[PDB]
Short mmCIF file of C-alpha atoms and ligand atoms in Angstrom, two decimals:
data_model
loop_
_atom_site.label_atom_id
_atom_site.label_comp_id
_atom_site.label_asym_id
_atom_site.label_seq_id
_atom_site.Cartn_x
_atom_site.Cartn_y
_atom_site.Cartn_z
CA UNK A 1 -3.76 11.88 -2.42
CA UNK A 2 -0.66 13.62 -1.23
CA UNK A 3 0.05 14.17 2.44
CA UNK A 4 2.46 17.03 1.76
CA UNK A 5 3.38 18.96 -1.37
CA UNK A 6 6.62 16.91 -1.60
CA UNK A 7 4.59 13.82 -2.18
CA UNK A 8 2.96 15.43 -5.19
CA UNK A 9 6.42 16.31 -6.58
CA UNK A 10 7.67 12.72 -6.15
CA UNK A 11 4.50 11.35 -7.81
CA UNK A 12 4.70 13.63 -10.81
CA UNK A 13 8.43 13.04 -11.34
CA UNK A 14 7.78 9.32 -11.29
CA UNK A 15 4.83 9.58 -13.66
CA UNK A 16 6.87 11.70 -16.06
CA UNK A 17 9.79 9.27 -15.83
CA UNK A 18 7.47 6.43 -16.85
CA UNK A 19 5.77 8.43 -19.53
CA UNK A 20 9.18 9.35 -20.91
CA UNK A 21 10.33 5.69 -20.99
CA UNK A 22 7.19 4.55 -22.78
CA UNK A 23 7.49 7.33 -25.37
CA UNK A 24 11.28 7.20 -25.81
CA UNK A 25 11.55 3.44 -26.09
CA UNK A 26 9.73 3.72 -29.44
CA UNK A 27 12.41 6.01 -30.98
CA UNK A 28 14.38 3.10 -32.52
CA UNK A 29 11.17 1.73 -34.05
CA UNK A 30 10.10 5.08 -35.54
CA UNK A 31 13.64 5.46 -37.00
CA UNK A 32 13.63 1.92 -38.41
CA UNK A 33 16.59 0.87 -36.26
CA UNK A 34 14.38 -1.70 -34.51
CA UNK A 35 11.59 -3.81 -36.10
CA UNK A 36 7.98 -2.59 -36.17
CA UNK A 37 5.59 -5.07 -34.50
CA UNK A 38 2.19 -3.39 -34.74
CA UNK A 39 0.74 -5.35 -31.80
CA UNK A 40 3.78 -4.53 -29.60
CA UNK A 41 3.38 -0.81 -30.36
CA UNK A 42 -0.41 -0.86 -29.93
CA UNK A 43 0.05 -2.29 -26.44
CA UNK A 44 2.83 0.13 -25.62
CA UNK A 45 0.86 3.15 -26.67
CA UNK A 46 -2.07 1.97 -24.57
CA UNK A 47 0.31 2.07 -21.53
CA UNK A 48 1.55 5.51 -22.65
CA UNK A 49 -2.06 6.74 -22.94
CA UNK A 50 -2.77 5.74 -19.31
CA UNK A 51 0.48 7.25 -18.04
CA UNK A 52 -0.01 10.49 -20.00
CA UNK A 53 -3.13 11.34 -18.04
CA UNK A 54 -1.41 11.05 -14.62
CA UNK A 55 1.14 13.86 -13.98
CA UNK A 56 -1.22 16.81 -14.21
CA UNK A 57 -3.27 16.13 -11.09
CA UNK A 58 0.02 16.26 -9.10
CA UNK A 59 0.58 19.93 -10.00
CA UNK A 60 -2.33 20.95 -7.73
CA UNK A 61 -2.37 24.29 -5.99
CA UNK A 62 0.60 24.82 -3.64
CA UNK A 63 2.64 21.84 -4.98
CA UNK A 64 5.44 24.11 -6.07
CA UNK A 65 8.72 22.26 -6.06
CA UNK A 66 10.95 19.92 -7.99
CA UNK A 67 12.25 21.13 -11.36
CA UNK A 68 8.85 22.84 -12.01
CA UNK A 69 8.80 26.49 -12.91
CA UNK A 70 6.43 28.69 -10.94
CA UNK A 71 4.58 29.78 -14.08
CA UNK A 72 2.63 26.43 -13.99
CA UNK A 73 0.31 27.86 -11.27
CA UNK A 74 -0.05 31.51 -12.09
CA UNK A 75 -0.79 30.68 -15.68
CA UNK A 76 -3.20 27.88 -14.81
CA UNK A 77 -5.20 28.10 -18.07
CA UNK A 78 -2.10 28.12 -20.32
CA UNK A 79 -0.36 25.18 -18.55
CA UNK A 80 -3.75 23.35 -18.72
CA UNK A 81 -3.97 24.10 -22.43
CA UNK A 82 -0.51 22.51 -22.92
CA UNK A 83 -1.30 19.32 -21.00
CA UNK A 84 -4.69 18.92 -22.70
CA UNK A 85 -3.05 19.55 -26.09
CA UNK A 86 -0.34 16.97 -25.28
CA UNK A 87 -3.02 14.49 -24.34
CA UNK A 88 -4.87 15.17 -27.59
CA UNK A 89 -1.62 14.50 -29.51
CA UNK A 90 -1.48 11.20 -27.55
CA UNK A 91 -5.01 10.40 -28.91
CA UNK A 92 -3.61 10.82 -32.39
CA UNK A 93 -0.71 8.52 -31.61
CA UNK A 94 -3.16 5.93 -30.22
CA UNK A 95 -5.17 6.08 -33.41
CA UNK A 96 -2.06 5.49 -35.49
CA UNK A 97 -0.91 2.62 -33.26
CA UNK A 98 -4.37 1.02 -33.27
CA UNK A 99 -4.39 1.23 -37.08
CA UNK A 100 -0.97 -0.45 -37.25
CA UNK A 101 0.12 2.32 -39.60
CA UNK A 102 3.85 3.02 -39.31
CA UNK A 103 3.84 6.24 -41.34
CA UNK A 104 0.95 7.59 -39.24
CA UNK A 105 2.85 6.49 -36.11
CA UNK A 106 6.03 8.36 -37.10
CA UNK A 107 4.18 11.59 -37.79
CA UNK A 108 2.17 11.39 -34.60
CA UNK A 109 5.30 10.55 -32.58
CA UNK A 110 6.99 13.71 -33.86
CA UNK A 111 3.99 15.81 -32.84
CA UNK A 112 3.97 14.28 -29.40
CA UNK A 113 7.72 14.91 -29.03
CA UNK A 114 7.27 18.57 -30.01
CA UNK A 115 4.58 18.90 -27.31
CA UNK A 116 7.03 17.43 -24.77
CA UNK A 117 9.75 19.89 -25.88
CA UNK A 118 7.44 22.88 -25.73
CA UNK A 119 5.95 22.28 -22.24
CA UNK A 120 9.64 21.78 -21.18
CA UNK A 121 11.11 25.00 -22.44
CA UNK A 122 8.14 26.79 -20.81
CA UNK A 123 7.35 25.06 -17.54
CA UNK A 124 10.58 23.19 -16.51
CA UNK A 125 13.63 24.78 -14.67
CA UNK A 126 17.21 24.43 -16.07
CA UNK B 1 14.36 -0.17 -23.05
CA UNK B 2 17.09 0.70 -20.64
CA UNK B 3 20.45 1.97 -21.80
CA UNK B 4 22.18 0.96 -18.57
CA UNK B 5 21.08 -1.05 -15.55
CA UNK B 6 20.60 2.24 -13.62
CA UNK B 7 17.86 3.19 -15.99
CA UNK B 8 15.99 0.01 -15.14
CA UNK B 9 16.31 0.83 -11.41
CA UNK B 10 14.96 4.37 -11.90
CA UNK B 11 12.04 3.02 -14.00
CA UNK B 12 11.04 0.38 -11.49
CA UNK B 13 11.29 2.75 -8.51
CA UNK B 14 9.05 5.18 -10.34
CA UNK B 15 6.56 2.49 -11.33
CA UNK B 16 6.43 1.22 -7.76
CA UNK B 17 6.01 4.77 -6.44
CA UNK B 18 2.99 5.22 -8.71
CA UNK B 19 1.58 1.83 -7.96
CA UNK B 20 1.92 2.59 -4.26
CA UNK B 21 0.10 5.95 -4.59
CA UNK B 22 -2.78 4.40 -6.52
CA UNK B 23 -3.15 1.59 -3.97
CA UNK B 24 -2.56 3.67 -0.83
CA UNK B 25 -4.84 6.53 -1.78
CA UNK B 26 -7.77 4.13 -1.37
CA UNK B 27 -6.97 3.40 2.32
CA UNK B 28 -9.30 6.14 3.64
CA UNK B 29 -12.12 4.81 1.45
CA UNK B 30 -11.67 1.19 2.56
CA UNK B 31 -11.66 2.41 6.21
CA UNK B 32 -14.76 4.55 5.70
CA UNK B 33 -12.89 7.75 6.53
CA UNK B 34 -13.57 9.04 2.99
CA UNK B 35 -16.74 8.48 0.90
CA UNK B 36 -17.06 5.50 -1.45
CA UNK B 37 -17.79 6.59 -5.05
CA UNK B 38 -17.93 3.33 -6.99
CA UNK B 39 -17.14 5.00 -10.33
CA UNK B 40 -14.14 6.87 -8.81
CA UNK B 41 -12.74 3.60 -7.43
CA UNK B 42 -13.44 1.64 -10.63
CA UNK B 43 -11.40 4.19 -12.58
CA UNK B 44 -8.65 4.24 -9.99
CA UNK B 45 -8.29 0.50 -9.93
CA UNK B 46 -8.09 0.46 -13.72
CA UNK B 47 -5.03 2.79 -13.40
CA UNK B 48 -3.63 0.53 -10.65
CA UNK B 49 -4.12 -2.53 -12.89
CA UNK B 50 -2.04 -0.91 -15.68
CA UNK B 51 0.67 0.24 -13.27
CA UNK B 52 0.84 -3.15 -11.50
CA UNK B 53 2.03 -4.86 -14.66
CA UNK B 54 4.99 -2.48 -15.19
CA UNK B 55 7.75 -2.91 -12.55
CA UNK B 56 8.61 -6.53 -13.24
CA UNK B 57 10.12 -6.10 -16.70
CA UNK B 58 12.63 -3.63 -15.12
CA UNK B 59 14.14 -6.37 -12.94
CA UNK B 60 15.72 -7.99 -16.02
CA UNK B 61 18.96 -9.91 -15.79
CA UNK B 62 21.88 -7.80 -14.50
CA UNK B 63 19.70 -4.89 -13.26
CA UNK B 64 20.87 -5.38 -9.71
CA UNK B 65 20.69 -2.13 -7.80
CA UNK B 66 18.46 0.20 -5.88
CA UNK B 67 16.86 -1.14 -2.70
CA UNK B 68 16.41 -4.57 -4.42
CA UNK B 69 17.77 -7.64 -2.71
CA UNK B 70 19.92 -9.94 -4.81
CA UNK B 71 17.59 -12.90 -4.25
CA UNK B 72 15.25 -11.46 -6.99
CA UNK B 73 17.57 -12.89 -9.72
CA UNK B 74 18.90 -16.11 -8.30
CA UNK B 75 15.43 -17.16 -7.30
CA UNK B 76 13.88 -16.12 -10.61
CA UNK B 77 10.93 -18.57 -10.41
CA UNK B 78 10.01 -17.61 -6.82
CA UNK B 79 10.19 -13.81 -7.40
CA UNK B 80 8.13 -14.42 -10.59
CA UNK B 81 5.59 -16.40 -8.59
CA UNK B 82 5.22 -13.42 -6.19
CA UNK B 83 4.71 -10.82 -8.91
CA UNK B 84 2.26 -13.03 -10.82
CA UNK B 85 0.40 -13.76 -7.56
CA UNK B 86 0.30 -10.02 -6.76
CA UNK B 87 -1.08 -9.35 -10.21
CA UNK B 88 -3.73 -12.04 -9.73
CA UNK B 89 -4.74 -10.37 -6.44
CA UNK B 90 -5.04 -7.14 -8.49
CA UNK B 91 -7.49 -9.02 -10.82
CA UNK B 92 -9.61 -9.75 -7.78
CA UNK B 93 -9.52 -6.12 -6.72
CA UNK B 94 -10.55 -5.08 -10.26
CA UNK B 95 -13.50 -7.45 -10.12
CA UNK B 96 -14.62 -5.97 -6.82
CA UNK B 97 -14.20 -2.40 -8.08
CA UNK B 98 -16.03 -3.17 -11.34
CA UNK B 99 -18.90 -4.66 -9.31
CA UNK B 100 -19.07 -1.54 -7.13
CA UNK B 101 -19.05 -3.81 -4.10
CA UNK B 102 -17.44 -2.12 -1.09
CA UNK B 103 -17.20 -5.24 1.08
CA UNK B 104 -15.57 -7.15 -1.80
CA UNK B 105 -13.24 -4.16 -2.32
CA UNK B 106 -12.11 -4.10 1.33
CA UNK B 107 -11.31 -7.81 1.37
CA UNK B 108 -9.46 -7.68 -1.92
CA UNK B 109 -7.54 -4.57 -0.82
CA UNK B 110 -6.30 -6.43 2.27
CA UNK B 111 -5.11 -9.34 0.13
CA UNK B 112 -3.30 -7.00 -2.20
CA UNK B 113 -1.66 -5.22 0.76
CA UNK B 114 -0.48 -8.56 2.19
CA UNK B 115 1.11 -9.39 -1.19
CA UNK B 116 2.90 -6.01 -1.11
CA UNK B 117 4.16 -6.70 2.45
CA UNK B 118 5.36 -10.19 1.61
CA UNK B 119 7.34 -9.36 -1.58
CA UNK B 120 8.87 -6.53 0.58
CA UNK B 121 10.10 -8.55 3.51
CA UNK B 122 11.59 -11.00 0.97
CA UNK B 123 12.96 -9.01 -1.94
CA UNK B 124 13.56 -5.43 -0.61
CA UNK B 125 16.71 -4.25 1.37
CA UNK B 126 16.36 -2.45 4.77
C1 LIG C 1 3.73 20.18 -19.67
C2 LIG C 1 2.28 20.15 -19.95
C3 LIG C 1 4.56 18.95 -19.92
C4 LIG C 1 4.42 17.97 -20.87
C5 LIG C 1 3.40 17.86 -22.00
C6 LIG C 1 5.49 17.11 -20.62
N1 LIG C 1 6.23 17.41 -19.54
FE1 LIG C 1 8.01 16.65 -18.98
N2 LIG C 1 7.94 17.70 -17.29
C7 LIG C 1 7.16 18.80 -17.04
C8 LIG C 1 7.43 19.45 -15.84
C9 LIG C 1 6.78 20.68 -15.27
C10 LIG C 1 8.45 18.69 -15.26
C11 LIG C 1 9.07 18.95 -13.92
C12 LIG C 1 8.35 18.17 -12.79
C13 LIG C 1 8.96 18.43 -11.43
O1 LIG C 1 8.18 18.83 -10.55
O2 LIG C 1 10.21 18.26 -11.26
C14 LIG C 1 8.73 17.68 -16.17
C15 LIG C 1 9.69 16.70 -16.01
C16 LIG C 1 10.03 15.69 -16.89
C17 LIG C 1 11.05 14.73 -16.68
C18 LIG C 1 11.87 14.52 -15.44
C19 LIG C 1 11.09 13.74 -14.36
C20 LIG C 1 11.90 13.48 -13.10
O3 LIG C 1 12.27 12.35 -12.84
O4 LIG C 1 12.13 14.37 -12.30
C21 LIG C 1 11.10 13.97 -17.83
C22 LIG C 1 12.05 12.82 -18.16
C23 LIG C 1 10.10 14.47 -18.68
N3 LIG C 1 9.47 15.54 -18.13
C24 LIG C 1 9.86 14.03 -19.99
C25 LIG C 1 8.76 14.36 -20.79
C26 LIG C 1 8.49 13.74 -22.02
C27 LIG C 1 9.35 12.72 -22.75
C28 LIG C 1 7.26 14.26 -22.38
C29 LIG C 1 6.38 13.89 -23.57
C30 LIG C 1 6.25 12.40 -23.83
C31 LIG C 1 6.93 15.24 -21.40
N4 LIG C 1 7.84 15.29 -20.41
C32 LIG C 1 5.77 16.02 -21.47
C33 LIG C 1 6.14 19.21 -17.97
C34 LIG C 1 5.67 18.58 -19.12
C1 LIG C 2 7.57 -8.15 -5.37
C2 LIG C 2 6.95 -9.06 -6.37
C3 LIG C 2 6.91 -6.85 -5.03
C4 LIG C 2 5.57 -6.53 -4.98
C5 LIG C 2 4.36 -7.42 -5.23
C6 LIG C 2 5.56 -5.19 -4.58
N1 LIG C 2 6.77 -4.62 -4.45
FE1 LIG C 2 7.25 -2.85 -3.63
N2 LIG C 2 9.14 -3.09 -4.18
C7 LIG C 2 9.76 -4.27 -4.54
C8 LIG C 2 11.13 -4.18 -4.72
C9 LIG C 2 12.10 -5.27 -5.09
C10 LIG C 2 11.43 -2.83 -4.50
C11 LIG C 2 12.79 -2.20 -4.61
C12 LIG C 2 13.03 -1.64 -6.03
C13 LIG C 2 14.41 -1.01 -6.17
O1 LIG C 2 15.11 -1.44 -7.10
O2 LIG C 2 14.77 -0.12 -5.34
C14 LIG C 2 10.21 -2.24 -4.15
C15 LIG C 2 10.04 -0.91 -3.83
C16 LIG C 2 8.87 -0.26 -3.46
C17 LIG C 2 8.77 1.10 -3.11
C18 LIG C 2 9.83 2.16 -3.19
C19 LIG C 2 10.03 2.67 -4.63
C20 LIG C 2 11.08 3.77 -4.73
O3 LIG C 2 10.74 4.91 -4.98
O4 LIG C 2 12.27 3.51 -4.66
C21 LIG C 2 7.45 1.30 -2.73
C22 LIG C 2 6.80 2.58 -2.23
C23 LIG C 2 6.81 0.06 -2.90
N3 LIG C 2 7.67 -0.90 -3.31
C24 LIG C 2 5.47 -0.20 -2.57
C25 LIG C 2 4.74 -1.35 -2.89
C26 LIG C 2 3.35 -1.47 -2.69
C27 LIG C 2 2.44 -0.47 -1.99
C28 LIG C 2 3.04 -2.68 -3.28
C29 LIG C 2 1.67 -3.32 -3.48
C30 LIG C 2 0.59 -2.37 -3.97
C31 LIG C 2 4.27 -3.26 -3.70
N4 LIG C 2 5.32 -2.43 -3.48
C32 LIG C 2 4.35 -4.52 -4.30
C33 LIG C 2 8.99 -5.48 -4.71
C34 LIG C 2 7.61 -5.66 -4.70
#
């Protein structure tokens, strides 16, 4: 869907921005600094689930650019492993949110965050 | 969810970027220049539906900025009318996509596009 590689970069940056907001806005709730409304979080995590499936298709072949390291393309199977693993951690977070289980939510949220941090150290430029 | 008004601007620009890609990538299909796969479009419009609900909450009070005209805030009810109307046009597009009806899709797509163009002329700076 991208006319030029630059369009893919702008799409993925925007998808990751949104994904990041929908994940990060739950930090005060996980820490107990904001109230836990199970329905609010269930709906939020549904949005996060949709958004979390979007960036990866905008790292197609030849879409080098942005703050992306070149290792995303040469190590196709390893990058793919990390996105699919991240998405599976999102499934766990969805299950916790759907259950309205705060403890399960907190644990899953930490696992998701670790997946974010790992793909970052590996596949994002300084 | 925004620490500063700037964060709201970056969120909404990113949401609108994504919304725009998910709408615009269907143009070749509506025009017959690309094949119509009803399942592909149904899934795409489901993504568009989720994305189309996101920008508006990032035009909260005092989030003036970006390429947004100031009339968004002073005419709160009118801007709100236009987003809710846009979202209702998205419901129509979803119904057409779910039905796998190409003619219905094309008509709905034009109505959605007109809603985009109108909010633009009114609420977006040159
Ligand atoms: C690899 C499989 C990743 C996972 C999982 C996550 N992110 Fe990431 N992110 C990744 C790359 C390769 C990039 C650079 C994209 C580019 O082309 O520039 C990014 C970028 C971000 C950004 C910045 C987006 C921008 O506006 O430019 C943010 C804020 C971000 N990533 C956050 C983030 C979070 C919070 C994640 C888990 C919820 C996460 N990313 C996962 C690669 C990967
Ligand atoms: C009013 C209710 C709008 C509707 C409906 C749509 N858009 Fe719009 N869009 C609107 C505003 C006020 C802005 C400016 C936001 C800012 O603070 O800068 C925009 C912006 C865009 C952009 C640019 C995003 C960016 O990266 O900065 C695009 C590409 C865009 N809008 C496209 C678009 C399309 C295709 C729409 C229908 C599917 C659409 N917008 C609806 C206001 C409104």
